[PDB]
Subunit: 337 residues, 5 copies
C-alpha cells in the first residue's frame, strides 16, 4: 500500500522477477522491441593518426519497454541497485567500429537501472571506447576528418529489435563541450538505418563528428623551422665566394637539416604510401636549400676565370631566391586553404 513501505516494495519487485526469463526478449515472438538511445558525451580523450582511432567517454542510455516489468500500486519510478541488471533482459548493443571498450567500475559498476510503472526500463552505462577511424592524410595537417561511432544489435535482427535516436537531433549532448587541443568539432550528425548481413537485417545507429585540425601547432613546429632553414641558406649569398669552407658549411647544414625534418615528421605519422600536404612543403623547401648549395658550386667553379660573372650570380641569387620562395609559399597556401 504505502510507497514508503519497503516490505511492500520488495514484494512488488519479487513478483516482477518471479517467472522472469532473461533468455527471452520483451514481446518475444511478436512485434520487435523498440530501443531508444541517448548519448551524453563526457569527453573525447585523444585522436591518434598513428593508430587511426579516437578515444571516447560517454554516458550511454538505452530506453525500452518490458511488459513483464510493469507494476501497479506504486506511483513512483523505481531506481534500483545496478546489480539488478544481471536479472533482467538488456539489448545486445555493441559498437561496430570499437577496438577496445570497457564500463567503469569504481566504486561500483557505472550502471543505472530505473523502472517505470508501465514497464519502461532506463539502462545507463558510462563507457570509455576506442573506435577505429580511418583518416585521409593527403591534406594533412590542413585536413578535415570524419570519425563515426556505429551502434548495432549483435544477435537480434530487425524482426526482433529496432533502434532509434530518442529525442531526434537532441539525442546526443555534450558535443559543444568537447575540448580537443588539436581539433575543432565542426558538426555532428545522427543517422538511423538498417544494414543487411548474411544472418539478416540489423538496426544501425551512427554518430559521426567532422573534425577540423588546428594549424597553430604545425606552424610553430614544422612550417616556421623550415622557413628559417631556407632563409639560413640565403646567408651564403652575401658571404664572399673565397670563403669556401663557410659557404659549403651553410649549404651542407641547411640541406641535411631539411632532410632530418622531413624524415622525422614521417616517422611520427603512420607509414602511408602517399605524399601529404606538409610533405610537399618540406620537399619544396629542400629544393631551395639544395639549389642554394648548387649556386655556390657554380660560383666556385668559375670565380677564378670569370670573377665578374660569379659576382653577378651571387648578386642575382640574393633577389631570385627570396622572390621565388615567396611565390612558392603563395601558391602553396592558396592550394591547401
Amino acid at each position: 500500500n504505502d510507497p514508503g513501505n519497503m516490505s511492500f516494495v520488495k514484494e512488488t519487485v519479487d513478483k516482477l522477477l518471479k517467472g522472469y526469463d532473461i533468455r527471452l526478449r520483451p514481446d518475444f515472438g511478436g512485434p520487435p522491441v523498440c530501443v531508444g538511445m541517448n548519448i551524453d558525451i563526457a569527453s573525447i580523450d585523444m585522436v591518434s593518426e598513428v593508430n587511426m582511432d579516437y578515444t571516447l567517454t560517454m554516458y550511454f542510455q538505452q530506453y525500452w519497454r518490458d511488459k513483464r516489468l510493469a507494476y501497479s500500486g506504486i506511483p513512483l519510478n523505481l531506481t534500483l541497485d545496478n546489480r539488478v541488471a544481471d536479472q533482467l533482459w538488456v539489448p545486445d548493443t555493441y559498437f561496430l567500429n570499437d577496438k577496445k571498450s570497457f564500463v567503469h567500475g569504481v566504486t561500483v559498476k557505472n550502471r543505472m537501472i530505473r523502472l517505470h510503472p508501465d514497464g519502461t526500463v532506463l539502462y545507463g552505462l558510462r563507457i570509455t571506447t576506442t573506435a577505429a577511424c580511418m583518416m585521409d592524410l593527403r591534406r594533412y595537417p590542413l585536413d578535415e576528418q570524419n570519425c563515426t561511432l556505429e551502434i548495432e544489435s549483435y544477435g537480434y535482427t530487425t524482426d526482433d529489435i529496432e533502434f532509434y535516436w530518442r529525442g531526434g537531433d537532441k539525442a546526443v549532448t555534450g558535443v559543444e563541450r568537447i575540448e580537443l587541443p588539436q581539433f575543432s568539432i565542426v558538426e555532428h550528425r545522427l543517422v538511423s538505418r538498417n544494414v543487411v548481413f548474411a544472418t539478416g537485417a540489423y538496426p544501425r545507429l551512427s554518430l559521426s563528428f567532422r573534425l577540423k585540425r588546428n594549424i597553430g601547432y604545425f606552424i610553430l613546429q614544422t612550417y616556421m623551422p623550415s622557413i628559417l632553414i631556407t632563409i639560413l641558406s640565403w646567408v651564403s649569398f652575401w658571404i664572399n665566394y673565397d670563403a669556401s669552407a663557410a659557404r659549403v658549411a651553410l649549404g651542407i647544414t641547411t640541406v641535411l637539416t631539411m632532410t632530418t625534418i622531413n624524415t622525422h615528421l614521417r616517422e611520427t605519422l603512420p607509414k602511408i604510401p602517399y605524399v601529404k600536404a606538409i610533405d610537399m612543403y618540406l620537399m619544396g623547401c629542400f629544393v631551395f636549400v639544395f639549389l642554394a648549395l648548387l649556386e655556390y658550386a657554380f660560383v666556385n667553379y668559375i670565380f677564378f676565370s670569370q670573377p665578374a660573372r660569379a659576382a653577378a650570380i651571387d648578386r642575382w641569387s640574393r633577389i631570385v631566391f627570396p622572390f621565388t620562395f615567396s611565390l612558392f609559399n603563395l601558391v602553396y597556401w592558396l592550394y591547401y586553404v
Copy 2:
C-alpha cells in the same frame, strides 16, 4: 547474550540479512539517505601534461545509516569481513572525471565494512584513480594548475541520495604529506552542490587542488642551455673577421642548436596550438643568435672595402648583444613572475 559468543553474533548478523533486499536503498520511498564521505589521500603518483591527467591513490570512506542493519544486545561496533559488502546496499558512487580507476585487491580486496548498533555503515575503499585535468600551458613552466576530483551518484538523484563532506573542512586529510617533485600544493578546497541533468538533479562533491609548478628543473634543463648557446654566439664577435669558417660555424651551430632545443621541448608536451611562456623565451633567444650570424654576414660583406667600419660593428656588437639580451631577460622574467 555474551558479545564474545560467536554463535550469538552469527545469529544476530543472519537476522539482519534475512529478508534484506540489496536492490532497495535505505528508506526507499521516503527521505533521501545522507551519505558522508571522507578521503585520506595516500599519494599523488604523477601529473601528466601530455595526457592531461593525474594519478591519485586514496582511502575513500562512505558513511550512511541503514535501519535494516540496526542491531541490539551487542554494545560493540561490528567489523565484518569485506566480502559481506556484496550482500549489502552501497551507494553508486563514481568519479565524474576519472579515466581509469581500480580497487586494490592484494591480499584481499582493499575494502572495509564496519557496522554500528543504530544501523550506521562505514564503507572504506582504497582506490587508485587517474582523473582528467585540463591544463592551461600558456604560462608554462611558470603556470599554476587547478585539478579537481568530482564525486557524484550515478543512478540515484537528490530525491534518493544526498552527499556531504563528513567533518567539513577536515573531510580530506593527507594533502600536506603529498610529495610531488615537480609541483607544490598551494591549497585544496571542498565543494558540495547539486548538478541538474536530463534525468534529474544529482548530488556532487568536488575536491580540488591548486598546483604550483616548480621552476628548478626547467632552469637547469631549458633556460640555462639557451643562455649558454646565446653567450656562445657572442664569441664570434671577438674572432677576427678573416676567419670566415670559424665565425660562420659559430653562427650555424648556435642557430641550429636553438631550433633543436625549441622543437624537442614541444614534442614532449602535447600538441597545443598556442605559444607558451617558454616558447617565447626560446624564440627570443633564436633571434639573438640569428642576428649574431647576420652580424658577421654584414661584416664579411664590407670588411674589404670598409675595414674600419667592419671593425666598429664587431666592437659595438660586443656591447649591444650582451646589453640587449640582459634587458630581454629583465622584461621576460618580470612578465611571467
Copy 3:
C-alpha cells in the same frame, strides 16, 4: 501453442535444458559432431615486423547440430540472450598461432546464440586476435608475406569433432574491404585438414592471406634520402681542390649521414642476422659516398706535384660517379622487382 506466447516459449526452453549435460558433446559416444565455421573479417588492425604478428578483428561463427536442443511446435528460429551460451555445450575452438585474443564485452559480451527447430545452433563471437606471423625480410621492403590463422579443436579429436568451412570458398567474407595502408591483400585461401599429435588427430582449419608490401612509403623515407645524399657527395667534384675544408666536409657529412640512415633503419626492424634488400641498397650507397671522399684524398695527395692529373681526376669523377650510380640503380631495381 502460440509462438508469441512467452509462457509457452519459456516452457519449451526449460524443457530443452532440463537434464542437459554441458560436459557431454552432441552425439557423445557416436559419430563426430560436424562444426561449420564462417568468418566475417571486420578489419586487420596492424601488421608488425618487430613483433612478427598481426592483429585481426572478425565475426567468428560456429555451426553445429545438437539433437538435445531440438524443439517442436514453434515454427520460428529462437534467438536467445547471449548468457544462455553458458548453459550449452560449445566447441572448444581455439586459434593455434594466436598470441593474445579476447571477446568484446561492451555493452554485453559480443556473443550470439540462435537455435533452430531441428537442434541446429548458431554461435557467433566478435574476437580481436593477435596471431603470430613469421616473416622473411630478405627482400624487404619489396617482400611478399603469407600470414595464416590456424583454427583447431583443443581437446576433442577427429573421433569426436570435425571441422569444415561452411559455404566453401565463401566461408570468409570482408577480405576485399580490408584497408592496410602498408600492405595489399593479393589473395586469401581456405584449407581444411587433420593434424596428428601425440594425443590423436585433430581437425584443422587454415585461413591465409598473401600480403604485398607497398613501396611508396619507403621511396619517400629511405630510398630518396639515400639518393640525395649520394648526389650531395658529387658536389665536391665541382669544388676546387684547394678548398680542403669544404670538400672534406662534404665527404664527412655524406659518409656519416649514410651510416646513420643504415643503422637507424635496422633498429626499427627486429634483430635479424641476414642482409635485407634495403640493406644492400644502403651499403651500396655507402661505397659511392666513401669513394667520393677517397677521390679527393687522392686528388689532395697529388694536386701539388701533378696539378694536371688531379684536375683530370676531378673532371672524370664528374661523369663516372653519376654513370656508375645510375647503373647500380638499374641492376638493383631489376633484381628485386
Copy 4:
C-alpha cells in the same frame, strides 16, 4: 578412524565448515587474533627512479589460529586445495605503499592452505607487488636508498588483529640471494609497531632494504665520456693559433657535446628541481671546455699585435687546464665518496 580413509576426512572437513561464518574473525568479540607473517623473497625485479618504485616478488605467508577449525582424531596436518580459502576467514592484509600487485594464477591461484589439529591455519600467497619508494637523488649516482614494504590490516584495528614477525629476525628470507645489477643490498630490517588513524590503531609490519647503487655503469656511461670530451678540448692548445677553423671547431664540438650529455641524462631521470651529484660534475666539465674555447678567443684576439703573449697563453694553457681539471676531480671524488 583411519587417516587414510578419505570418507572420514571428508566428514571431518565438512563438520569444520558446518555453521562456519566467514564474516566473523576468530575469537570475535574477545582477545585479538595474532597473525604471524613470514616472507620468502623470490626476487626484486627492478628499481626505477623514474617511477620512484620497485617491483618485488615474494612468498607471503600468514600464520594464525582459528578454534573453529580445530579437528581431532587425525594426527596429521591437512593440506587442502587452495580453493578452500574462499570458505575460510583470512586476514585483510594489504600493503600500504604498493602501487600495483597481483597473485599469480598459473596453473592455479598461487595459494596455499594448510590446517593443523589445534586450529592453526597456514596461508601462503605468491605475490608480485610494485611498491612506491621515494628516493633522494642529490648524491646520485653515488646515493644510498632505503625502500620499505609496509604491511597493515585494512579494516580490523589492534583490538581485533595483531601483527608480529614469525621467527623474529629470520622472518624474511632470500634477501642475500637477490640479484640487482645496479644495486647491492647493504642491510634489511624488520619493524613491528601500531599506527593510529582516525578509525583507530592498526597493526603495522615494515620490511626495509638499504640499497647501495653500483657506480660501474655510470663510470663507463657518463663519467668517462665527460673526461674524454674535456681532454679533447685540450687538443686545441697544441694546434697553431692560425688554424682558426680547426680550433673553433674543437671548441664548438666539445661545448655542444657536453651540453647534450648533461641534458640527455636529466631526461632519463624524473623531473626533480635540485642539482644532483652527477649534474655537478657535468656542469664542472662544461666550464673547462667553455674556458678552453674562450682561451682561443683571447689568443685569436691578440695574436696579431702580440704574438709572443699569445704563444705563452697557449703554452701555459697546456699545463693549467690538465692541472686544474685533475684538482677538480680530486675534490669532487673526495666529497661524494
Copy 5:
C-alpha cells in the same frame, strides 16, 4: 549399457562426482599422487636482455590417477567439456621463475580434460609465460645463455605429490621447431629433483635451454660501422698537413661518432656495472681514432720548424695504424671466439 547412450553416460559421470571432495587430493592420507608432465613448446616469443626474461608459449599437460574417477562399463576414454575441471581436483602446479603467465581463453579456456576407465586424468593447458632468466653479458654479443623453466607444486610437499617427466627425455617436444631470429637452441635438458624449504620438501621439474646468440646482426649493426669509422680516421694521414680544418674535422667526427656508438649501445642494454665484449671492441676503436687526431696534433705542432720529420710521421702513420688495428682485430676475435 550402450556407450553411445548419452543418458547412461550422464548417469556415470554424475555418480563419479557425487560425494567428490575437490579439497582432498587423490589418495589423501596415503601414498603421494604421482603427476606426470609433458610440454609441447609452441614457440619462444622473445628473449629480452633488458628485462632479463623470455616469453614462452606451450601446451602443458599433467597426468595423474584419481581412483574416485574410475568408471566401469564404458570401454572408451571420456573427453569432457573443459568446464568440468572446476569440479575436479587438479595439482597446484606453478612455475617458480615466471613473471607473468596466463591461460588462453578464446574461444573457450584453452583447457582439456580427458578421463580414463581406471581413473587416470589428462589435464592440458595452453599457457603463455614470461619467465625470468638472469644473463651474463660479459661475452655479449658472443655469449651463450642458459634459461630455465622451473616447475614445482605450491602447497603439497613430497609426502603428498611427486613429479616426473612422462616419457623421459621425450617429455618436451617442439624444441627443434623453435624459431628465434637472434638465438639458436644448442641443447635442452630435463631435470627432476626435490627442493627442501622451511615448509618441507617439494617436487621440482626443470626445463633448461642453452641459447647461442647469432652474431650476424651485430656485425652489420655495430662492428662494421666501428671499422668504417676507424678507417675513416685514417684518411687524414693522406691529407696535407696544411689543411688544418680538414684533418681536425676528420679527427673530431670520428672520435665523436665512436663515443655516440658506444653510449647508444649501452643504453639499449640493461644498466650492468661490468665491461662487455663489445664494449672492449668499441673502446679499442676509440683509442685508434683518438690517436689519429693526436697524430695530427703532433704533426701540426712541428711541421713548421721540422717539415721533414712531420712528413715522415704522416707517412709512417699510413702503415702503422692499419697494421696495428689489424692485429687488434686478430687478438680480439681469437679471444672471444
